[PDB]
Design a protein around this ligand. Sequence first.
Ligand SMILES: [K+]
Ligand SMILES: [K+]
Ligand SMILES: [K+]
Ligand SMILES: [K+]
Ligand SMILES: [K+]
Ligand SMILES: [K+]
Ligand SMILES: [K+]
Ligand SMILES: [K+]
Ligand SMILES: [K+]
Ligand SMILES: [Mg+2]
Ligand SMILES: [Mg+2]
Length: 1336
Amino acid sequence: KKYSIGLAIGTNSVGWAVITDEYKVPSKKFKVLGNTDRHSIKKNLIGALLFDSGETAEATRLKRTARRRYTRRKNRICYLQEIFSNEMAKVDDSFFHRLEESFLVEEDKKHERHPIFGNIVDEVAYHEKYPTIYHLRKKLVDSTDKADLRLIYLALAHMIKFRGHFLIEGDLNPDNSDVDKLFIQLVQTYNQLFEENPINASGVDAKAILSARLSKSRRLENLIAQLPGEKKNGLFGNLIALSLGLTPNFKSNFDLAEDAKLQLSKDTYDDDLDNLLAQIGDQYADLFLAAKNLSDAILLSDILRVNTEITKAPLSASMIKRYDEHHQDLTLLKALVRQQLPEKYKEIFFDQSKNGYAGYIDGGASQEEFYKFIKPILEKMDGTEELLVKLNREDLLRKQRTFDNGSIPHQIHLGELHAILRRQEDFYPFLKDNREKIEKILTFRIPYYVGPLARGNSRFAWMTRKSEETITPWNFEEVVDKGASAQSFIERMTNFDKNLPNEKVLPKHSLLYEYFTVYNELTKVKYVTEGMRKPAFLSGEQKKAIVDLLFKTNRKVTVKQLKEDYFKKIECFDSVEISGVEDRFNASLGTYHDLLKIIKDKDFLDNEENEDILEDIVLTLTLFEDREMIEERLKTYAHLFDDKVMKQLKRRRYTGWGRLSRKLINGIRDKQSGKTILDFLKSDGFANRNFMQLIHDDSLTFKEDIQKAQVSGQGDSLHEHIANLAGSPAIKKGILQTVKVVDELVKVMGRHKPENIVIEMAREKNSRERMKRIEEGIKELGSQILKEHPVENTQLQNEKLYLYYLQNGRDMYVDQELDINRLSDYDVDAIVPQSFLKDDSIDNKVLTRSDKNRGKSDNVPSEEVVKKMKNYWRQLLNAKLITQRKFDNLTKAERGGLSELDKAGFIKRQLVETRQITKHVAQILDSRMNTKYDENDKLIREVKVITLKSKLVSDFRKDFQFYKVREINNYHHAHDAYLNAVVGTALIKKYPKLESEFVYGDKATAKYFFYSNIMNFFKTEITLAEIRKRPLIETNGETGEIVWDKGRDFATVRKVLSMPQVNIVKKTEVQTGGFSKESILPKRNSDKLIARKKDWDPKKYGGFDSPTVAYSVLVVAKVEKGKSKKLKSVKELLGITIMERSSFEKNPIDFLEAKGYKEVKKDLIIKLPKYSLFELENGRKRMLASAGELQKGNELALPSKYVNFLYLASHYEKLKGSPEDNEQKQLFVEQHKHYLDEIIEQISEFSKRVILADANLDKVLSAYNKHRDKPIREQAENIIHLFTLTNLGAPAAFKYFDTTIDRKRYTSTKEVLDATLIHQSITGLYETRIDLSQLG
RNA sequence: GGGGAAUCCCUUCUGCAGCACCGUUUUAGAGCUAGAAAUAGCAAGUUAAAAUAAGGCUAGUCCGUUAUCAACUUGAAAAAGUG
DNA sequence: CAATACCTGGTGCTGGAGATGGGATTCA
DNA sequence: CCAGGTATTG
Ligand SMILES: [K+]
Ligand SMILES: [K+]
Ligand SMILES: [K+]
Ligand SMILES: [K+]
Ligand SMILES: [K+]
Ligand SMILES: [K+]
Ligand SMILES: [K+]
Ligand SMILES: [K+]
Ligand SMILES: [K+]
Ligand SMILES: [Mg+2]
Ligand SMILES: [Mg+2]
């Protein structure tokens, strides 16, 4: 008894099928367990497991870190309160107790209800004097009087609780505060450098123009307009643009060749500036640094909108400015509306439901919604011009706690905190003693490279301590070992050398590593001149000369340089042909040139004695990111360099790690030669063996030493192994389920292993990434396309509009603008034609007026287009608006275009799967199935694991009319698996040589023809560019075994796809995750509310509702009834919530008695997870959605003829085929038009038996009878929509044409308590059926 | 002969750590006047405290939403076994 | 009870490693 | 976007 298995692995399904020799699906009697009269049942061996998607760990992580931030913010306040404790007890012995209980109702409070002062006169007086906290903050910063200790606490607490961001290193307000003074200094520096062309900046109000609440480019336009004889793209204009935050190009200013694009925000600017300064000199450094200072002031002027010489609290004064203008503007708005629109006043100022001032202050209206609600009312009235100005500046009626306070750096709050401490330490000695402690509470951050400050009970922690004692913000540097911690942060993430598993890999930018990479590439270079008979390798002396003369004097070494600067200069060759490198060398000595710039001592770099020192320096610069730690580590070399060099050295940092270890590169030596790997790369006689040859050469000891160094460690379990794969957790869920399905199928077949296993694996928020890409690209481009055409992220889900913005509103094959409103008239074209590369992503598509203008449709865009457009394409590449892959495919015609080999490769790629994840699944199945070794100790492959891509069965389905309609039911997953088994087994039966291509385990026109016609053996006649005919029966050529009988096997496939009994099993799952919805609801007289804290009665405090049920439980017990508490027997479903789950499981009887049940039959408790399956009357099935709702449980097996009619009539897929075959399909659609009514009838019978939605079914029948005159295509398309009424699972809304059908829900689970519960194995072939009516 | 390696250019995704700003919720910020009352007319509004999974023991400036799960038998569990 | 309409926490930033698909040079 | 919880309305 021989059989094969087909598998269809997806993110929400695993289809499976068992086939025999004749491509038939077996069927068996399977035993049924349980308490019903059915002892067995007949099952076909085909089906599909369905399951909810596996989730990433991201949401879990974001909640976990937020949790930590709330804990630490609370600890911050606790540190401050501990510092204040004793002196506060002398002033007000319960002040902190009133703060802690502020949330409680007066009934529950233990102290007086007024928090700050504990009496109403003083509390009212406080709020009258300080209407916002920022009033109190400003007062305490500016005033010189002794102040109440409770107000000092509230000010410091407010700063420490909401302390601002940490994006700026170092201290602030370093005389970079004033925009006027920094603009003056920029003009002074510029006029120093350009005495003949000076700028007249008198009368120019730089403060107002650059700090105006306007766009960067408009402020640039304003300032340049104030300077006659200067254009925005001149040098001074470009400096101002750089200060405002734009991305100016300094190339034309200094007549450069290298594009000097500079943005002060990019990480590369530090290098991008030195780069530019290398071409123009360092006299200009003082200029570009002057512009940088100006930017800081301009950034500060966005936050601090008040004169900094009238107060040391400009932030608080700016909030107070918000409050005063809010008050004045509210008074004016009230008066204006009173006078002009007196009837709207109540709606504006009393109705929280509307987006007026009432809904803005008390309702749910945001600042944006309120501005939208009141803009027409202001434009409608008179005297609202200044209010409209403030509204369009987003500066009308502002609150102080707003979404845009994310700009505020912590140094600002720190400045006010420090000033308050300096004022009041003169009156409170403990503030003087604790001033720096309090500052440290605000400033201290746990470094990202330290992680949680755990003590052995966190699986996320890596931090190590220097001493075992509690860590505080003040003892952190002494208790935490930051060095060891930062080292572990990297090392727990980096790979070891695979060749020497106990050796750490080198830093990617290490000098040794770059020598290795350069010599490895250079040793395989060959050259020819005239008098030479044969190309020659470079000798050791030639390679050393090329390294010293070229690689150690240029960052990049081109082939032109090799030819001219070496072969001409040294070897006296006028012509020489180079091979083994193209255009320029890929490897380079970048660190060598970095350090040469920093330390300026070539002889230090070239002296092998300093090799270790330079290796340790780069290691430090790679391993650590903190400049203080870097400085501490480099301190041991301080005596070798100057303090200037040491400062430049610590500012230089690298990231990234190599893939080989130092011990491998330059440690182990060949036993007889005594030479390391690097020694061989430098000089290897005339063989010039590279890395691969060296470690694979049996005459050297490298290979054997690698073999000895290997280890294996502890083996992963199957689950572990799958978890460590690279891929989406969703597809990893499908992989594990697939393995479990195969194990059960083998057990079904009497532990006999199959002959073949054929696997196919499906292909695999976003709008904000689209908007970010376009914003970055457009601002890098310097374009105003977002000025002229504002777009929202949702709109970018349109493919053409997204392409329009990515192309800067231009045609891509023609140098012309496109029109947004004409997008429907344009074409979206494939760069590499989709007949070769089935790529439909933006990486292979392009928006053009007319696809004709590409050239010839059979290849890459033509050479003429490439000559026209390569410059524009390069700008798109630099702005990252197209990728390197896209640019290379666009420009390929200048490299010969598509060769015949490229076309052969693309066709083969459409058939031979090469994704890494599918290889891993095949390796897993193959290593589980094949475990024995033969006489030569080689693996015995009893089971061939075959992998196919989806196109094979898809083309098979379309070519032989086995069409799929996904919406009809879930059978197509199973059918896909069946067709994979059939096609895959037949393919390797017919062409066993292709086993290397499709089976796991160890001329261009010819292969193009071959792989294009690989599947023709299925056809009876093939029309290929004339008509050839194949025999009825197809056999293998060598064995003579039959592989495909076209008279009998297609009938077998048809019968298999027509079987109505298919094992669709929805994986039952316990629900996990959040306890409930997160919304904190207002107080309500409802027992659905859940307390947010143990003592917060939700009727007084509000709280949550809508908990998630982890699983339901069948309880058979008694409950008290009536005022007499009489015991009445019950049987019901109790949903255990996720929050309740631990308590219920720790002791179920006590849990159930607490819920009210008595005398619980403990052994009749049935755990019922989501999607538990119940069967009622007439085959009607239901699934548990929760404890109080059910899902649909039945599948609608629509006969094959109706499915194929629906596919053809609806044009479900593209109308590909001969026009005569198109006509025959159209003729069949029209000859079988009565099928439409029959399909409705099939749906109707099904619903009346199983769905029971009388209102919906009647609305549907009326809708179908309403559009009987509609075209057949559209009626078929809408019949596809109808199947939502019958689909398995949760009910859902759908539309028949323009009629909307709302979902009919099953809001009661009472009936399943007397139905039959069905427990299903993973395949559903094994069942346990429990008649629940026999309980109770 | 290699779906194996290094390098260059990138693309995409997965794991983790550190931080900010809002939002919500209860309370505090004396509403006034005319009416016996429902109510009417007016005044006012911007701020704060505290919580932000209930909580846990291991008591850390730690942990608490990912992954994994038919039933049954033997099991404390892990597990293995059962058609 | 069964049916209907409404609800549903969100945004921004910093740092690091790996594997990954695929074009290119050299190899095993 | 799904789809289960919830209060309103009968
Ligand atoms: K009280
Ligand atoms: K000008
Ligand atoms: K609001
Ligand atoms: K190259
Ligand atoms: K680093
Ligand atoms: K020195
Ligand atoms: K789960
Ligand atoms: K889930
Ligand atoms: K199951
Ligand atoms: Mg907490
Ligand atoms: Mg708040």
